[PDB]
């Protein structure tokens, strides 16, 4: 079923915090690339850029918790 129960939201928050290794408050594009490598992805510049742009409503090169949460809500 599509949905984020509190437990999933907690997991997403923990993951977010971890991926924000810098502790910037936002995951930098590079940290997101590292995260995607941790997720076992194969980055491709154009796809990465476009996906990042879609998620990056406001975070301007970084991804805020809410933006990351939105991504996670969409992708699961």
Swiss-Prot record:
It comes from the Eukaryota. Residues 7-42, 43-76 form the EF-hand domain. Ca(2+) 2 binds at residues 56, 58, 60, 62, 67. Belongs to the centrin family. This calcium-binding protein is found in the basal body complexes (the functional homolog of the centrosome in animal cell). In mitotic cells it is specifically associated with the poles of the mitotic spindles at the sites of the duplicated basal body complexes. Binds four moles of calcium per mole of protein. This is Caltractin. It comes from Chlamydomonas reinhardtii (Chlamydomonas smithii). The lineage of its organism: Eukaryota, Viridiplantae, Chlorophyta, core chlorophytes, Chlorophyceae.
């Amino acid at each position: 079923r599509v949905g984020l129960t509190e437990e999933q939201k907690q997991e997403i928050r923990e993951a977010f915090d971890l991926f924000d290794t810098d502790g910037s408050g936002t995951i930098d594009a590079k940290e997101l690339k590292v995260a995607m490598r941790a997720l076992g992805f194969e980055p491709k510049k154009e796809e990465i850029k476009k996906m990042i742009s879609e998620i990056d409503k406001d975070g301007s090169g970084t991804i805020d918790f809410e933006e990351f949460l939105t991504m996670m809500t969409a992708k699961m």
